Amino acid sequence: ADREDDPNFFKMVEGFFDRGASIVEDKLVEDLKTRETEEQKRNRVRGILRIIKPCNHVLSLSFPIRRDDGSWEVIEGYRAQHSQHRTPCKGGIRYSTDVSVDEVKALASLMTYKCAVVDVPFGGAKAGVKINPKNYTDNELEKITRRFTMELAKKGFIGPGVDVPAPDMSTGEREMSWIADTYASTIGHYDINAHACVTGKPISQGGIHGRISATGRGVFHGIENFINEASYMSILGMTPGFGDKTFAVQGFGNVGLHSMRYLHRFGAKCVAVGESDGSIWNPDGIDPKELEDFKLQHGTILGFPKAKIYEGSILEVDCDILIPAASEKQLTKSNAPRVKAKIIAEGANGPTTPEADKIFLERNIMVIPDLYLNAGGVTVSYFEWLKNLNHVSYGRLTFKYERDSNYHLLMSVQESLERKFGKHGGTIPIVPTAEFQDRISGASEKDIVHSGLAYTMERSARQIMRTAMKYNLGLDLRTAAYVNAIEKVFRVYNEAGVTFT
Amino acid sequence: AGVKINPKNYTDNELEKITRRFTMELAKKGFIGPGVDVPAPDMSTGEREMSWIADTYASTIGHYDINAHACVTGKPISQGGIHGRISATGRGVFHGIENFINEASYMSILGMTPGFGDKTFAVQG
Amino acid sequence: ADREDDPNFFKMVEGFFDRGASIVEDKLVEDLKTRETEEQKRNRVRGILRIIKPCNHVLSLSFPIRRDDGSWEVIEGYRAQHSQHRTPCKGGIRYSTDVSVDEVKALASLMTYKCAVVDVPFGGAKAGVKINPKNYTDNELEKITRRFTMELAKKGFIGPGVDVPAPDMSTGEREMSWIADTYASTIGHYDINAHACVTGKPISQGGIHGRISATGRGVFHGIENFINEASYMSILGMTPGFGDKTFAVQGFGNVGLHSMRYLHRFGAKCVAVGESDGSIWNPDGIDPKELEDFKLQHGTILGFPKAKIYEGSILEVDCDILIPAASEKQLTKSNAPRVKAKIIAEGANGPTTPEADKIFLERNIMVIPDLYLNAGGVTVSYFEWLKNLNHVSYGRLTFKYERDSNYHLLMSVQESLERKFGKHGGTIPIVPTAEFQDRISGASEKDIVHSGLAYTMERSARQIMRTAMKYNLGLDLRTAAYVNAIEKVFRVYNEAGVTFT
Amino acid sequence: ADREDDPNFFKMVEGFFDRGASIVEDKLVEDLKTRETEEQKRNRVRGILRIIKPCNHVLSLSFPIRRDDGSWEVIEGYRAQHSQHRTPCKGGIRYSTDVSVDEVKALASLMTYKCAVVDVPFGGAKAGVKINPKNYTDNELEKITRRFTMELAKKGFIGPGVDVPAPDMSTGEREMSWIADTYASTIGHYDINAHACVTGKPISQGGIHGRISATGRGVFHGIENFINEASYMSILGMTPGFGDKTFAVQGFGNVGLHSMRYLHRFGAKCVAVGESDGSIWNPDGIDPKELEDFKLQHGTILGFPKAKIYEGSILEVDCDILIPAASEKQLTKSNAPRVKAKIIAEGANGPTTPEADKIFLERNIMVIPDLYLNAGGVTVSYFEWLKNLNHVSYGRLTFKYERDSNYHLLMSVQESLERKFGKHGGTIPIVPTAEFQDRISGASEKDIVHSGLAYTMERSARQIMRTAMKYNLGLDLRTAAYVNAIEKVFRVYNEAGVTFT
Ligand SMILES: NC(=O)C1=CN([C@@H]2O[C@H](COP(=O)(O)OP(=O)(O)OC[C@H]3O[C@@H](n4cnc5c(N)ncnc54)[C@H](OP(=O)(O)O)[C@@H]3O)[C@@H](O)[C@H]2O)C=CC1
Ligand SMILES: NC(=O)C1=CN([C@@H]2O[C@H](COP(=O)(O)OP(=O)(O)OC[C@H]3O[C@@H](n4cnc5c(N)ncnc54)[C@H](OP(=O)(O)O)[C@@H]3O)[C@@H](O)[C@H]2O)C=CC1
Ligand SMILES: NC(=O)C1=CN([C@@H]2O[C@H](COP(=O)(O)OP(=O)(O)OC[C@H]3O[C@@H](n4cnc5c(N)ncnc54)[C@H](OP(=O)(O)O)[C@@H]3O)[C@@H](O)[C@H]2O)C=CC1
Ligand SMILES: Nc1nc2c(ncn2[C@@H]2O[C@H](COP(=O)(O)OP(=O)(O)OP(=O)(O)O)[C@@H](O)[C@H]2O)c(=O)[nH]1
Ligand SMILES: Nc1nc2c(ncn2[C@@H]2O[C@H](COP(=O)(O)OP(=O)(O)OP(=O)(O)O)[C@@H](O)[C@H]2O)c(=O)[nH]1
Ligand SMILES: Nc1nc2c(ncn2[C@@H]2O[C@H](COP(=O)(O)OP(=O)(O)OP(=O)(O)O)[C@@H](O)[C@H]2O)c(=O)[nH]1
Ligand SMILES: Nc1nc2c(ncn2[C@@H]2O[C@H](COP(=O)(O)OP(=O)(O)OP(=O)(O)O)[C@@H](O)[C@H]2O)c(=O)[nH]1
Numbered sequence A, C, D: 001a002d003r004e005d006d007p008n009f010f011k012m013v014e015g016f017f018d019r020g021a022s023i024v025e026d027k028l029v030e031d032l033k034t035r036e037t038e039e040q041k042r043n044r045v046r047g048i049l050r051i052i053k054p055c056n057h058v059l060s061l062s063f064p065i066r067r068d069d070g071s072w073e074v075i076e077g078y079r080a081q082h083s084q085h086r087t088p089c090k091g092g093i094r095y096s097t098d099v100s101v102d103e104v105k106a107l108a109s110l111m112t113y114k115c116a117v118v119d120v121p122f123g124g125a126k127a128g129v130k131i132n133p134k135n136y137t138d139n140e141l142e143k144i145t146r147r148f149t150m151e152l153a154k155k156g157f158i159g160p161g162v163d164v165p166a167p168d169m170s171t172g173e174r175e176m177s178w179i180a181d182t183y184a185s186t187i188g189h190y191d192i193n194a195h196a197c198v199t200g201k202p203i204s205q206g207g208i209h210g211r212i213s214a215t216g217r218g219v220f221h222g223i224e225n226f227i228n229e230a231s232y233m234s235i236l237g238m239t240p241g242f243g244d245k246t247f248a249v250q251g252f253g254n255v256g257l258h259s260m261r262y263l264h265r266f267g268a269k270c271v272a273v274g275e276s277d278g279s280i281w282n283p284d285g286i287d288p289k290e291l292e293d294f295k296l297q298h299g300t301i302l303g304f305p306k307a308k309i310y311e312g313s314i315l316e317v318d319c320d321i322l323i324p325a326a327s328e329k330q331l332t333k334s335n336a337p338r339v340k341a342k343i344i345a346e347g348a349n350g351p352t353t354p355e356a357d358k359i360f361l362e363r364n365i366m367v368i369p370d371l372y373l374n375a376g377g378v379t380v381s382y383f384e385w386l387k388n389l390n391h392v393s394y395g396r397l398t399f400k401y402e403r404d405s406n407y408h409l410l411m412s413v414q415e416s417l418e419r420k421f422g423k424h425g426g427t428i429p430i431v432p433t434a435e436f437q438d439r440i441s442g443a444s445e446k447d448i449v450h451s452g453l454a455y456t457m458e459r460s461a462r463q464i465m466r467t468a469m470k471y472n473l474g475l476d477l478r479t480a481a482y483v484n485a486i487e488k489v490f491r492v493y494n495e496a497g498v499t500f501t
Numbered sequence B: 001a002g003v004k005i006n007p008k009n010y011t012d013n014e015l016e017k018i019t020r021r022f023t024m025e026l027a028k029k030g031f032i033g034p035g036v037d038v039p040a041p042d043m044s045t046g047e048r049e050m051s052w053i054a055d056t057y058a059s060t061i062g063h064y065d066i067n068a069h070a071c072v073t074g075k076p077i078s079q080g081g082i083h084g085r086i087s088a089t090g091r092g093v094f095h096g097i098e099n100f101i102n103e104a105s106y107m108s109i110l111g112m113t114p115g116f117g118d119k120t121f122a123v124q125g
């Protein structure tokens, strides 16, 4: 962000990894099966961690496209595959002028550790195309996407069993449609799983309910899991719950907008919203719905009638919770002194530098880390991939059977009681509550996504708190998450004997 | 499948090579694959050999197969193994005995009481 | 490696390309059968040249190996594919600590243009592994080589119809054997052309006669084609021919040793040899055999009894012809003022910076450029690939038929003359000269390699001379070669309509 | 069979291998590159020879067919691949009740060493189906063949670049047609080389001129190369040449009939012919043409009008040359004392036991060994495979250009002499002899099969003679052949580093 506050993104994530490696090193050496404790054990542990951290594969591309006015342009693209310790690699595609090999490797490694934290059986990957999509027509972006797909597919950097992309900054449903159609019409014409080659697809194409809003819905769940912990909310000097709290979100895209929709729903009040244009502000609250309608209509948030063009940086606005939901390295050493919030919920990937971490720790500011908090996108992408593999809408085969079963179950209770308390207890109707009537046919896809997401966001939160307490890490939840991620990944390399995976 | 060696006479380094190689020769001739032929442990092989088999398969012929790790069973749990495979054969030895040891019709021809609480056994191996 | 004579290798080769592009730009715009100028024709031309310049594909690798001690090491590797305008890419593998993405991209592009100069139907590629092979056992190097092969094969960066590697610095026959065996035993088990996946193989494995010495044999042919040109030898102030000239060679490896073997054979005098150790010197001549025998025996050329340890840089030694046959960027701006030879024969790839080119021009020093002079290696690798595709030793099917044919041909002349000048002439024996008796059965593989190489080195030389005369380039033969390479490559992008090739 | 004269066919060929290994062991240790002559050289050499001996792969098959009357029948089949040191394995298919794993492994190893003797770049393989084809209809044999092909193809035991079968006993043109059609219509439908999956095909079907007679034509050439060697014919006490010698052939099938056709053509007289039925005899000569006509007409040779039913074993008939052209192990310990002939030309594979070798040596009987003498079939099969790879009839592109070229060559001589000896010389016509006129368009496919075969039969004979002298092996030409074969195969294992080839 600043100058000399601007570390190498990949090394910075390596630093987070090293932090966590220091703390579990003893525990890893502990539960080793192996021969003689010459702590050659210790060196074996440290050799495996050396294998995990670098990317295994990075493809760099140049390829031409023919612009709308007839000119030729060369555009560059990358896709890094950080780890294959679990076989389909997973990670999004970013269209931005900031894309580099540097940045794509960093995000690929975050994907590996994030999947381990939430227990999604994917290795990490990430792709980037070095363009500003503002400067291209829809016709041009289709050509760029379709061709990026074919160059990746010929070199084994996309495929249902190899590497499954997804949306990231400046890509969405529409690009994923183009990726899936290009794959399933060329290399994947005979693959029964061709459409599992990418996630974030439109629902009419093998998409899944809620994937668009999935990352924000998991930002809500991850904040709620900590905002309702008395142990943590006391060190921060705050009341548990949402009903009284304010937040600011940087970024009004896929992550920002839905984070703000869900927190607003549960009582919290949106105080400030920012984009690259600038920010808006209103201490009385901003409504997500009418702000979205405004942006859709005018292409900017600036000039929203029910708020204030805020001069003075979103990141330092006064609120309880600050949600970075845009680029990386937004909270720096020069920046953290004024942050004025007590909870930093990283919706973005890598939005805080290590020395901003130092500061936040000694002001008792809680950073809910990216590799836990934004993992809702990859969790629901995992559900979408599973759905394509199965070729049925969840519940489709069982709705009627379930509904009938549950009525006969309840009827069994009714008839059993009528038998006992016979003739002059009369009729004892056993009927579903209003809530059970909703579930009477069993889960649909929407139900699976919702409760599946909530289950893993909370199982993961409680593993991070368990770990932070056991190593006495206070509010350094980032280190706790990496400790968890490292332990999971390390076990696969143990039994395997490495050499590859 | 069978390999004519006595594994006690080999180092772990040597057994890894034997196993990884045996896998490749089988895979080239279509004698291992998720939809073709799925090996498993037997005498003197276990979790460890099954790891080597799955890794060798999924890193060569099966690099693009979404089901590469279904090429062998008995794998360690951290590797796509399943809970209880190690003890599975004995747990089914227990169930298969109990299904007959509680059958009065059969336990009578044998002159025995139903149930386990009063019986001795010997195991070879 | 110094501090401000040390340009980015890939950009530097781009610069050589740009000069050549300047000069043919008019001639490319000329022969365009397309609609009419609007000088959209001119924009089309430099849009195509913009597509040719960058590498299409670069794979970066990390993978672990088990050292002999039991320790784990991560080693890096790269392979760039510069162009697919001709389908099998071609280029060597370098094991060196100087290997990087930009070094591998630079060498890959030189391979494209060198193949075009000599009319070998391959696109350019190059691989690198970032190790110093002197620090590894043969066991360890086997491992590294066989790994590197499998990682390349899974991602389509090696294959008979995709990308065919070859030796480079610190690799040879032995590594090529490991590469071919690993390929043909895994991914290529059913490919009838599996052993065409790499060239430079041992003869017993589908190698071809003379590949080892092929680069030096083409260094000799390329010097001889210019050393016997009165027009050029006059601007330099020298006598045509080899019989009176001295040379120094930097590098005593695959290129250096055989360059020095062949020049010594045709009368020239080797005055100095260098390696990384240092150099040796003797103005009376060094013999290539006994120097080779000494190196094989002691592992160094320092201390050769028949010469004396030269202190003072082999590149400035006093000779007629200087042969850089080692690393790149050896002749720099700080260096060229004292070069003291009048012919610089670039056996190595990229051994002169652009800044040193400027100087050598003004001093009337003739640089025979790499993309012409060292192309003997890829020319004979092309023959080896063809041989593997055909599955016969040249001549095998025809030796006897050919030998019998030629004797009946000669007998036809004999009997025809005996018929006419009847018995006043007796017997008129028609028999082969001693030289025809050698060819009586037609060419063998050795004959094909020898005369095939001489034919292309010579045709290519005269193409460069014509071009240098027709644009009045003087001794800037480097620009003439790039003009030729650009014309050949541009030809394919024209009719194709680009978009993929 | 012969009771306690009846060794394990595979072990017996291993024994032949071992005697050759004895003799070159010193030589092999000689030209090893490598470092420590520590008597670890010697152990490497033996370790490599231990790898070469055993078959790498043996597929055993059971599969059902429905017989013509509706009954089901399981039939067994095998195919052994002895070596992959050269990539397409090669070897025939035998339909016989004597087929076993041990017979198929023995013949497969013979194929490896025979291909090495004649320098055909194939590893050895052999298949067998355990039936007596005289007990099946043509309908039934088609189903057995087409099915045997599919079971081999699914497990990678047939394919143009894997394993290429051919005829053997009781199979021919017809079966090879069925094999090629089954392959090219299922697994090979997209393979440009599908029809190179088997050799011995009918000419209309991608077969090659002379494959049918090729084995006998090479029997003739291999006898002729030794029958015209004064050095050898003197130890036997015979006159060089064919014009005054008799021979007997056991087996009147593919090998026997054509061996007898070619020897009869060059003056030798056929004295006795045998099959499983029995034999016929006439010291006065048997004509191959009319004997063939009789067999085609009556299905047996017994009762040929111009000969008498011989009762007393054709192997002991009184002749100069005995040609075993049927099964293996036909000349035994109990048998060799009475053999009567001075030259045993092994057309069959493995027709002589090792103990019969011992005897023949001490009676100064010359055994021309199988791995040299019958290698004409695989030599011309190699030509057929090459032909299918090239997709042109030899000469097709060049006939007219050759003819024209040869006329103008000759005209150059004519005009050159006319200008020198001007007027008083008149016209000096230069015209082809009658022999050159046949050749004037260059070789056809027939010409290359003929002269190609003669070239390799002769080059191989000399190499055996050279070797038998360098080791003072007398008439033990079998050991000389194995010495040659072992040297060539050992080559490939040296540079390779073994582990897969
Ligand atoms: N896409 C997904 O589903 C997931 C994304 N993430 C991470 O979340 C972040 C973005 O996600 P996403 O919402 O998809 O990207 P989008 O393009 O959907 O939205 C990006 C938002 O960030 C804004 N933005 C970009 N740069 C800046 C900046 N320097 N200052 C302020 N606002 C900025 C854009 O506004 P403008 O148009 O004004 O630039 C836009 O509103 C990245 O870190 C990404 O890796 C993580 C998990 C899932
Ligand atoms: N290999 C081939 O077939 C072809 C190679 N080339 C180019 O030729 C050059 C070398 O080829 P090759 O002969 O194969 O390489 P080798 O590794 O075979 O031999 C290299 C020689 O160069 C010497 N050398 C290396 N670095 C230096 C240095 N910094 N200063 C002085 N001497 C040095 C080495 O000496 P030491 O042992 O002391 O390092 C060794 O004598 C490279 O540029 C290569 O790309 C071009 C065409 C074909
Ligand atoms: N086929 C080839 O191209 C080559 C074959 N060989 C070897 O040569 C032999 C095959 O010759 P081929 O002509 O191909 O086979 P065929 O089946 O074509 O002819 C076989 C001949 O041998 C006769 N025969 C079989 N067993 C006996 C026996 N025990 N005693 C006497 N005669 C017998 C058959 O008689 P009936 O007709 O009554 O069975 C028939 O006349 C085998 O050893 C084979 O491996 C080696 C190199 C090339
Ligand atoms: N961009 C945008 N998306 C919306 C809006 N309202 C609903 N959605 C999304 O559209 C999809 C379908 O809506 P619903 O069926 O109501 O979703 P839901 O499962 O009930 O849960 P929610 O996501 O909380 O609405 C869900 O993913 C919503 O998140 C909106 O106002 N703007
Ligand atoms: N060798 C050995 N294996 C054990 C022992 N206890 C459990 N296991 C096996 O380890 C696996 C995990 O064990 P648990 O965590 O106890 O789960 P479980 O299904 O209750 O195990 P069991 O009922 O004992 O089979 C199961 O397959 C057990 O059979 C033990 O004491 N010794
Ligand atoms: N390193 C090295 N290579 C040699 C030497 N002599 C010959 N060679 C190379 O080894 C191969 C075999 O050499 P030859 O049998 O003489 O065939 P050639 O084609 O006439 O060899 P040259 O013309 O000398 O290159 C050829 O590639 C030679 O260039 C030598 O003394 N040292
Ligand atoms: N079975 C059999 N084959 C024959 C006979 N005569 C010729 N052939 C073969 O049929 C093929 C075609 O015959 P030709 O036109 O004479 O060809 P060729 O090259 O002149 O044949 P040869 O010199 O006899 O080997 C050749 O392979 C001959 O060997 C015969 O009488 N019986």
Ligand SMILES: N[C@@H](CCC(=O)O)C(=O)O
Pocket (backbone or CB within 6 Å): A090, A091, A092, A093, A165, A166, A167, A168, A169, A199, A349, A374, A375, A377, A378, A379, A381, A382
């Ligand atoms: N860009 C998303 C991708 C998630 C997915 O692969 O679905 C992330 O950072 O997690």
Ligand SMILES: N[C@@H](CCC(=O)O)C(=O)O
Pocket (backbone or CB within 6 Å): C090, C091, C092, C093, C165, C166, C167, C168, C199, C349, C374, C375, C377, C378, C379, C381, C382
């Ligand atoms: N390194 C060699 C390799 C040539 C080849 O591909 O054979 C070169 O620079 O040309």
Ligand SMILES: N[C@@H](CCC(=O)O)C(=O)O
Pocket (backbone or CB within 6 Å): D090, D091, D092, D093, D165, D166, D167, D168, D169, D199, D349, D374, D375, D377, D378, D379, D381, D382
């Ligand atoms: N059975 C023949 C077949 C040769 C071939 O492969 O064509 C032999 O023994 O040599």
